[PDB]
RNA sequence: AUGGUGAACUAUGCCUGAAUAGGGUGAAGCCAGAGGAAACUCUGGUGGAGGCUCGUAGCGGUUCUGACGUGCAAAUCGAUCGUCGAAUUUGGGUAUAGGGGCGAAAGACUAAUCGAACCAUCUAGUAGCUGGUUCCUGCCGAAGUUUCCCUCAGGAUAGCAGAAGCUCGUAUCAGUUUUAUGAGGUAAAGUU
RNA sequence: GCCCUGAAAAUGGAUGGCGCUCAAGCGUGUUACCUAUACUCUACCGUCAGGGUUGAUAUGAUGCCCUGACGAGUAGGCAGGCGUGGAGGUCAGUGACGAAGCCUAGACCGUAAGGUCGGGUCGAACGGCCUCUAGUGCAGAUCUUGGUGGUAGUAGCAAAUAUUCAAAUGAGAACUUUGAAGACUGAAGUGGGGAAAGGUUCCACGUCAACAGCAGUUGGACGUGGGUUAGUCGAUCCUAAGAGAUGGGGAAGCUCCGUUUCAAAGGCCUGAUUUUAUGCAGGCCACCAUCGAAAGGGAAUCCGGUUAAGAUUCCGGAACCUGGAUAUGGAUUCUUCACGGUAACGUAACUGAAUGUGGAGACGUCGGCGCGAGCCCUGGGAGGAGUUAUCUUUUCUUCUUAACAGCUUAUCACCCCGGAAUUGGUUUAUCCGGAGAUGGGGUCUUAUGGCUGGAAGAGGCCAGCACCUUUGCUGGCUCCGGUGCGCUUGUGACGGCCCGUGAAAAUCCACAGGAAGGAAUAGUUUUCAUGCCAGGUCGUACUGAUAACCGCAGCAGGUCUCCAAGGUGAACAGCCUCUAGUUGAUAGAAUAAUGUAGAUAAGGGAAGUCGGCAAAAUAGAUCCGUAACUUCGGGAUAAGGAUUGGCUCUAAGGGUCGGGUACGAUCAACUUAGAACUGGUACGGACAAGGGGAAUCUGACUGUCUAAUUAAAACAUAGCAUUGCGAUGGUCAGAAAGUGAUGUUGACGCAAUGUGAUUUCUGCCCAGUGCUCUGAAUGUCAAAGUGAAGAAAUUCAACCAAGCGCGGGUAAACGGCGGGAGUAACUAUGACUCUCUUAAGGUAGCCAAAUGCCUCGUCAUCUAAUUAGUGACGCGCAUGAAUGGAUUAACGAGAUUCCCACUGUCCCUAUCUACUAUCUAGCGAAACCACAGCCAAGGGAACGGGCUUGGCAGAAUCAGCGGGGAAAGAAGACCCUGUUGAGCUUGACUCUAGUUUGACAUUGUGAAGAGAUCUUUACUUAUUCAAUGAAGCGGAGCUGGAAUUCAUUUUCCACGUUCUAGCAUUCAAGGUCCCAUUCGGGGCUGAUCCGGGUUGAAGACAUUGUCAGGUGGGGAGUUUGGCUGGGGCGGCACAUCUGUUAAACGAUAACGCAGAUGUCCUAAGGGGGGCUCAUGGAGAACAGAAAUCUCCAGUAGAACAAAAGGGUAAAAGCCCCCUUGAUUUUGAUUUUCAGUGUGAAUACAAACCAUGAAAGUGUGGCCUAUCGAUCCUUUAGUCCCUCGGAAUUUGAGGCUAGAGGUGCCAGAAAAGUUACCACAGGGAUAACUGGCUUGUGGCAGUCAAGCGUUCAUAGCGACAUUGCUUUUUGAUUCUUCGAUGUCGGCUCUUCCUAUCAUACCGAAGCAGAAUUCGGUAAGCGUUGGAUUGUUCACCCACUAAUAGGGAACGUGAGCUGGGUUUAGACCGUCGUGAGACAGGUUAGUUUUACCCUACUGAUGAAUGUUACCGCAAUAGUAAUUGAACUUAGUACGAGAGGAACAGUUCAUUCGGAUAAUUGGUUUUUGCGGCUGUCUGAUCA
């Protein structure tokens, strides 16, 4: 047979990311003395649009502790920040939108975003627009914290893991019908070559497992085992249930 | 099967450039007037939006089932037609290479090659199948049948045939009758 | 007996032909005669057999002779010879006095292959014989290479409008050169330049062999030369998307990863030196190769002139940049590092290191608005040219101003003053103001414009003088203005759009900071001026295409880009012109057919056709007017109507401008509306330029795709929904990896799918298959470990993960949605109860729908007529719900139906225009070809050009033509075979990458808790992950203080920064103390101390390696029987048995017929004994049609395991009694047969046994069937053989005899599929024509049982029998698969008769009229349509009639392409799937004639020359049918009704002409009219 279309994204030739207009990797600040023993203040210089992403970025400019200069970094902008805002970062900072605190330093029921999985990864969870995690509880001994991931999963992380207060800007984005194949063309030119999607039904027995036949139909179950093997996997993969919800 | 060569055509993404008369329709936004309690609705303007529309260059390639069909042309020529501001058109740079690539999907495209490219070797690949097989004359001269075979377009085996002769030569034979003596159960007859 | 009738088939026509009649016919008899390769006799050749002959003194003993007989021959075999290239010998061979070779209707020998000689050409080598050896003999192979024919002086050299006269050159001119004309490209060019590419094509001179598909004096050719000049233009430099070293890391390795990565990765700024230069000095800065753009970024150049060919490069002049050196003037300095203005900021200058920050480089698109530049238009003036018959203050042309430099200028931005309601300012576009608007006054940038310098001395245009030359010289003028919705490009300020916000870097500058360095008897500054020196390397020519590039080429194709004049007009459309450029494409004469491209048609108006295909009609603008429907956006140019030229006028729309603190004037526009007049009613006058409407199927839309047969209803899309995934991850890659894509990512994300906008809904089903599980059990489970037995190998027994097993969920997962029953007031409908299927029974909806076989469904409507269309109906072969179901406005080069308008599609053709064809000069192929080219019939491979019999036939040809040459194109794509393949699918057979588990190793330290090992959990240092220019870890401290003190602190928290877009750097200021004060340096602290674990997470688990189970079409390799009246299904004729087919020994076939076999039996085997069966008759309680008992008769009518046939009576049967011969060793024989195997049997022998008194009998079944190799496993036997250095015990291997199985039965281990297909072949074999048969089909006789008022034959025929038919359907499989082009229609010719009409006849139960049946008869006719691809059919209307057929089911180098029948796509059923179809639907490349004949037309040599007038052999032959008036309301007739011969006037179909008239046509461009444009207008 042939090598199918999803097996063909691994070698990553024309499928790589379209990286040109991107302002940079949006991260939080390296974890250092000043931030874990106290706070350090920047100001947000301009909040700007990043290509390929859905949410704006902010550029806050800190002062390097050990050398005379400025250093400016790329934060995914929480909703409500504004240029000219002081952004405080560190253990002793205060609870306000945009300030990055450790999670142990905030009461339960606090709404933070761009939170870290492990301390010093410079952010992981809830970076898409409109997302947030809630802090639902603490474990002050063998220090952990109980947070609610934007999907609704409940994860338990370290209490030295930082996160920035508030909701990520760009909420409401998918409320608007996209309305034409052109606007979906301008969406994925800045992301990657995924589009448009030929139904595996509509291709030949070589192109796909769903291909062939004098009618268009799958012919065998569209749910595939998690223990399937490379290229067998197309369709709903290792689903526990299927079909419209009620 | 192995080891090599190709994105100058074409496929799709990226980088950086360039290219596109004139018309029709007249969306938000905005201005004056008219009505009325109101929310608002009605008239005249203003503006100039859209994968809107007619149509040139451009890109295509619907119909004639036209011309041509040892052509101008291994895909062209004429009339007609689709679209013509965006999922557009295109130059160069660039990335993806053969059981791979790329595909808005036709098994399409990948240098006139694509249901597995191109080039050399393994390779004088294998063929129970088609075609061919080169001078004379003399003596002899068949077979399409038995048995067995994944045997039925083929082989082994026996038969028919040629050649080499060998021991011998009055002689045992014979696609024949006669006498003698068995077996038969078809034709007629109606058990013989 | 003969003859006739019965007796009819298609090109013309065959006793073989002519022809034959007291035969040349038929039946028979006697004779004569003809002639085969056979017969007889003879000669000769060879073959075979039988014999004769060895004596010197010859030449053969493979020899000579004698005698006889015999002679076909493919595949095949053998014997004997001929020929070729080399080797050994010999002829002391031949030969320049001519070897070899070649040509030779010259000669000789040989049966032949071949040999010998003569003559001619020719020039250096070569033969005969006894032998050796081999790349040794050609007619084919769609054979290889090479050469050449016929075709043929033929096909053609026809797009892009087009040429002509003269002169010059020359040997030669349609083509070269100049002039003169005529045209064209028309500035989106046929111009003026470049990019890629070429490479010298550029230019000059010479030359014309070849090339330029004609010519050539010309050339992009040929020979010889010459030509490309740079500090500024490019490259070079920078980076983009990417490529790629180093360090490291994999890899047997070629090499791979990665690009700042686990790295000790480097050279600077000057202070310290005045032994000398650079030691030592503090500080720094961590970006850490390189490559990557002639279109992006970027230091700087312009004008004029110049060459045969180069120029932003050379010349002359005028500038500028960069790198470097220093000198002069100015400026500054005593207030050491300038002043002014309130401010915006100003200026000739006017210090500045490390370090840091900011700007530039630096960016999308569209829309209008403003301002510029060039172009366009245009008035006054100064010149030159063209027109002037007349008019024209006229028409055309020259009046130009570079880089650079200095000075002034403007939107936007900004400052000051003042402080706004009575809110004002304000843009085309409504934004602005107490966060300070309008107003008054200023700053600023300088794209841009303005004046001055460049710079008039240049350039241009005029005139005037000299003159082989060289040529100059000489004057003049080179000026002042207007306008815009104009066009092109630049720019600025605004606006729109995005789930799209639209590069990087080198490079340069500014600012912050304050390192340092320097005024006073004098010290700086190269960012002010001026001056000085150097500016390298490679590119530079020319085309950029209807001949310089690529397409084999001098190819109508392909190929990125700039500039862009006037008119018409909306216009960069079309048409026409100015500047520049060509005039190249073979030509000349004629005007046949058929063509190709372009026009027109009387009347009708799709009647043509699969179908309105194709053409026509419409068209621009202005005013009037617009429907259903709709998602309210549209539909809409809906549909439809009215005007439009010319001239002369009227009206409305703008500007600049002066008013002491209402009006006047002038300038300049293309816009609209109105009114009179005007004419052959013409006016978007040419050009350019929608046809429209009522519905249906289908996809929402824009968009995309099979380049070169499909543009679609297919793919895509938005929208909808589902699924995995929280990074120690989801999906994927890699051979590996210190490895990679999504990811510069984080659920509003990434990945995997299915549906397809909107509206409206998405029913029931979890049994199957699949996926999943917070679920549970004690089933199965490998490796390791474990326990036992053994001397050990080893055997076994338990235990075990994951996986399956179990149970749960799951349908917008794959998918399914039946059967059997009941039950509502005539029949009947059937809401419901009941239950059988390992699940549920098709819900809403929709339908003969693209899904409905039957089927041309039934009903209505459309139409004169409808297999079409639409509306309804629905037990729907086989509709139906994200397999998505219904409905839908707008859209569509999609499929279909109807209507209006229009038409040559048609009736029904005709005419016309250019280019061909045709003829001529030059040039000049190819396809194809066995040999060829006249027919009829026959036979024959079943359709001959040749053969046999006839007809016939006269040189040589020209243009047409499409009948034939089963014409050419291609070792049939269809079907089938081969032990040939490939693509794809699966639960096929055999494995595999990956993944999920267990064990051992990495792997150390030790605690808890359950189980007779496991679950927790600690340790850190291995191992793993993560971050950072490895900065603030761990421990103790001091200060407060939450704290609340039960002795005193028991303990944790703390411990410099939160109104604000300011600022944070130099060992740190301060504080203190040192050193030898000397300017400054070294300490401590400021800033607590100790350990140098860089900081977090994880941790003996992950990971890693090696084994092990499981999972694994994601992938690989392979297979997917045989015979067969094609193949498939079935069957077993595949191993067997009986009867028959079988024709009296045996043998004998078919998918012939009737059946059977894969078992059954310790007796049904073996021996022995006694007895008699089936059945009938006659008797006996219950007792019956039969129980049981008894006697007779009883040849087998019973039984004998089973199929059938044989066999059997004191038995072979029935019943008893005893027994295991159904045993052991092995050889011979028969049967099927090779006299092999297996199976079954026969007869003995050697033992040992059963039975019987005994003879005897028995080696399974009374007889004919009931069965199996090698290899492997196993058992018995002897207790034998071997384990090979010698022994013992296990183990293993042998010999002999059994079993376990191959049914495809002489014995592989094996699923589909192809409509994407492939190869080698097959007419050994299908579909398709033909051939034969005729079952049928369809047609014609014979007897007449019988219908008909009686009446068998007016008119029939049943029962049946006898025939014919090749337009039925079949059967066979003879020709064709190295191809006979397949349906139907259109077109056109011809033949048959089986007569539909017409002619003439016979008949009736015929009065007439009418009709009917037959007779001769094929002369002549036979139609227009609706529905359908339709043949067929059936309807409508006409007709005298609307008969049946043949000709390769006539006819595709004649058409068409509707149908079947590829590849694309949709549906229904079916299959797990790829895929399949008694199917429906849509889209789909139709090649060649010039050859030979034939046909149709056209010439023609020889008939002594030549002319005119004829004859007529043979051939062809044509007219047709109807109606009206009359006869006549007569005849016949009660009447109703109602004819005919003759005569006459017109008509239908056909045919031949012809053109007076009518019509069509029009290049008479004959005359007139009209448009745009050009010639200056009138005119032409």
PDB file of C-alpha atoms (C1' of nucleotides) in Angstrom, chain C residues 19 78 84 168 256 399 446 621 634 719 781 853 938 970 1005 1031 1188 1221 1252 1280 1325 1450 1568:
ATOM      1  C1'   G C  19     -26.175 -27.331 -78.356  1.00  0.00           C
ATOM      2  C1'   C C  78      21.504 -44.056 -41.830  1.00  0.00           C
ATOM      3  C1'   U C  84      34.298 -23.057 -47.482  1.00  0.00           C
ATOM      4  C1'   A C 168      21.930  50.679 -60.222  1.00  0.00           C
ATOM      5  C1'   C C 256      23.711  10.419   9.966  1.00  0.00           C
ATOM      6  C1'   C C 399      11.593  77.420 -29.393  1.00  0.00           C
ATOM      7  C1'   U C 446      11.874  70.130   2.818  1.00  0.00           C
ATOM      8  C1'   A C 621     -27.344  54.536 -23.601  1.00  0.00           C
ATOM      9  C1'   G C 634     -32.178  39.426  -3.525  1.00  0.00           C
ATOM     10  C1'   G C 719     -21.528  24.684   9.470  1.00  0.00           C
ATOM     11  C1'   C C 781      -0.495 -19.168  30.317  1.00  0.00           C
ATOM     12  C1'   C C 853     -37.233  -5.960 -11.868  1.00  0.00           C
ATOM     13  C1'   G C 938     -18.875 -23.949 -59.350  1.00  0.00           C
ATOM     14  C1'   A C 970      -1.087  -2.326 -33.891  1.00  0.00           C
ATOM     15  C1'   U C1005      21.528   1.024  51.567  1.00  0.00           C
ATOM     16  C1'   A C1031      24.390  34.286  41.808  1.00  0.00           C
ATOM     17  C1'   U C1188     -51.118 -70.756  18.128  1.00  0.00           C
ATOM     18  C1'   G C1221      -7.513 -71.175  10.373  1.00  0.00           C
ATOM     19  C1'   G C1252     -16.166 -84.545  12.756  1.00  0.00           C
ATOM     20  C1'   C C1280      20.488 -59.406  18.191  1.00  0.00           C
ATOM     21  C1'   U C1325     -11.860 -22.280 -27.175  1.00  0.00           C
ATOM     22  C1'   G C1450     -26.178  -4.280 -48.179  1.00  0.00           C
ATOM     23  C1'   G C1568     -27.168  56.150 -54.683  1.00  0.00           C
TER      24        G C1568
END
